[PDB]
Amino acid sequence: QCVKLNDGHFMPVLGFGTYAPPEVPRSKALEVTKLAIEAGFRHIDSAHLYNNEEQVGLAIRSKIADGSVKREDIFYTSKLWSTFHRPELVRPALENSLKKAQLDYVDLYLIHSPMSLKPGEELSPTDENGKVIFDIVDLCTTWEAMEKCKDAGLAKSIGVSNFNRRQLEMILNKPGLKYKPVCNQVECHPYFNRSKLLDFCKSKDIVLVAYSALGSQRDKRWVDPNSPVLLEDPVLCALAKKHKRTPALIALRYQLQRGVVVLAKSYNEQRIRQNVQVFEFQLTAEDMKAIDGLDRNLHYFNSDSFASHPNYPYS
Ligand SMILES: NC(=O)c1ccc[n+]([C@@H]2O[C@H](COP(=O)([O-])OP(=O)(O)OC[C@H]3O[C@@H](n4cnc5c(N)ncnc54)[C@H](OP(=O)(O)O)[C@@H]3O)[C@@H](O)[C@H]2O)c1
Numbered sequence: 001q002c003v004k005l006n007d008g009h010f011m012p013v014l015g016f017g018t019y020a021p022p023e024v025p026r027s028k029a030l031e032v033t034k035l036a037i038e039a040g041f042r043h044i045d046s047a048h049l050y051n052n053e054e055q056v057g058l059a060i061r062s063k064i065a066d067g068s069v070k071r072e073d074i075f076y077t078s079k080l081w082s083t084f085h086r087p088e089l090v091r092p093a094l095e096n097s098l099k100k101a102q103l104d105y106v107d108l109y110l111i112h113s114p115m116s117l118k119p120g121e122e123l124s125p126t127d128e129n130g131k132v133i134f135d136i137v138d139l140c141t142t143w144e145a146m147e148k149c150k151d152a153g154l155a156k157s158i159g160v161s162n163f164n165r166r167q168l169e170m171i172l173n174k175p176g177l178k179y180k181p182v183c184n185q186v187e188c189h190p191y192f193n194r195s196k197l198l199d200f201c202k203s204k205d206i207v208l209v210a211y212s213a214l215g216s217q218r219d220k221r222w223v224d225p226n227s228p229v230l231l232e233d234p235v236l237c238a239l240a241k242k243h244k245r246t247p248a249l250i251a252l253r254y255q256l257q258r259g260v261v262v263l264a265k266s267y268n269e270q271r272i273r274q275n276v277q278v279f280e281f282q283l284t285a286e287d288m289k290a291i292d293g294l295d296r297n298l299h300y301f302n303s304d305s306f307a308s309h310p311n312y313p314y315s
């Protein structure tokens, strides 16, 4: 299953999440992306930030050489990192991603976050006090540079990530806008279900793409250990038992049935293959209402030290 995007292109509704923390060897991204393609994933989510585009690209090339897939069967996403928001840096950042992945185009290029950072090669530029250094950029000019990347055929589609409604409206209301964002990739799961943003996006034909849909990797660097564990939720577990599925499968199917495209990261061969079973069963309307009741406005990626950024999305 795919969803038609507002530029006429198609996006598979289940995508494979590729982020792994730096303690994971980069050889693993190569191995698990091949396994995901073998399992049936066709939408692969990467980014400059992830330090894995070379390996994800090698996995794609290898499965093309196998004869398993063609390039046109794979939906590959990359993201513009926040130190590259100044408009003259956007196309060179995209070309660099394409060179690492050894691809001629991406299917989707996103602005990774609205929070601009000091330009440079450092992904996390830090001052003498250990504070990450912000930059001020008009994201409408960043967007204009993304539009030129689509016109050049380097990205089939363009979208955003981590935007709130006012940030989306800033793009949608931009004078001389040529391409709307096809999607907004945001944190979305039963403890933070984004119903308000989803209704807004639906009204603008913008696809919401859920990340941390299984509750995040709970990295101690960015997630409070005392936050509740999504997949231990009693309602999700009771529904998994009723359906003879797993809590992860319930969480993924929840998104599919409300019109959300869903990502799922796993570096485990058996859970990768399990997640493709989201297409094998259905939740009832009563099940959906019970999951809708779980929202607690819980942000695993709260970016607490960045709350003072002018573009922090949760203001
Ligand atoms: N645009 C952004 O700012 C942004 C931010 C966050 C994430 N993302 C994208 O979204 C992807 C997914 O989000 P995420 O990394 O936070 O992780 P997630 O999809 O919420 O998954 C969290 C953990 O679930 C476990 N898992 C997967 N399938 C499972 C299953 N069937 N049963 C039990 N546990 C399961 C995985 O562990 P195992 O690996 O051990 O299986 C994974 O570490 C990311 O990789 C990235 O591609 C983007």
Ligand SMILES: CCOc1ccc2c(c1)C=C(C(=O)NCc1cc(C(=O)O)c(C)o1)CO2
Residues within 6 Å of the ligand: 019, 047, 049, 082, 115, 117, 123, 124, 132, 217, 219, 222, 306, 309
């Ligand atoms: C206003 C400053 O902005 C910055 C600057 C530097 C940063 C961050 C934010 C945040 C980082 C971070 O959250 N890494 C963990 C992670 C990222 C993703 C993803 O998929 O996008 C996943 C699943 O985990 C890296 O260092």
